[PDB]
Design a protein around this motif. Structure first.
Motif: not given
Ligand SMILES: [Cl-]
Ligand code: NA
Ligand code: NA
Length: 206
Positions: A91-93, A150
């Protein structure tokens, strides 16, 4: 120093609440240790573009995670070499904390500045540090960066002071995650923030 990273990533002395995060870093991270020509002591803007491209070795359709990318890039700048890169598919987040990333890459949490209220103030603070101590490379943490889809989210990126012949030093922001524009201007990067502004700067010191 790369061998220290390897020792930390593989160590048994890790709280098992952190072991998933560390495994994610391990899977993402590549270490190139072959002796090669260093980047110059006085970096060019073009050098920064090559360095930002190097750290982001993600697959097409995966974005990677800015916390890990920015730390890798900061490490590479510091050593003037393309050593660390990421192929992160996670995940990027979620699932990567800057404290854990810093402990892995640098061997300790980096000391953060006081909170700054705008990217303009970040630029000024960095120029101040350069003026006083010639500190020229930083990781920037932003609280409410507007990411595609997002929206407002935490984001890490980099800044380096570039000193060109007969020109005032300037801050070059670098966002190795934002591959559409890895060397944004101040005006461009400001587009990604509303007034909900909080920024911190940190840097590795040997
Ligand atoms: Cl993300
Ligand atoms: Na990618
Ligand atoms: Na941009």
């Amino acid at each position: 120093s790369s061998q220290d990273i390897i020792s930390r990533i593989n160590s048994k002395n890790i709280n098992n609440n952190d072991s998933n995060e560390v495994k994610r870093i391990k899977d993402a991270l590549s270490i190139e240790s072959k002796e090669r020509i260093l980047y110059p002591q006085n970096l060019s803007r073009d050098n920064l573009k090559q360095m930002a491209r190097y750290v982001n070795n993600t697959y097409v359709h995966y974005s990677g995670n800015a916390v890990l990318l920015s730390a890798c890039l900061h490490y590479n700048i510091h050593h003037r070499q393309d050593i660390l890169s990421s192929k992160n598919t996670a995940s990027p987040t979620v699932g990567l904390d800057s404290a854990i990333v810093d402990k892995i890459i640098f061997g300790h949490e980096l000391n953060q500045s006081y909170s700054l209220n705008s990217i303009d103030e970040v630029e000024k603070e960095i120029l101040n540090r350069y003026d006083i101590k010639r500190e020229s490379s930083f990781i920037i943490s932003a609280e409410n960066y507007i990411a595609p889809i997002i929206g407002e989210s935490g984001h890490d990126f980099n800044a380096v002071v570039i000193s060109e012949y007969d020109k005032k030093p300037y801050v070059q922001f670098i966002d190795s995650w934002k591959t559409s524009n890895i060397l944004p201007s101040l005006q461009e990067i400001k587009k990604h923030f509303s007034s909900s502004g909080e920024f911190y700067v940190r840097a590795y010191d040997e």
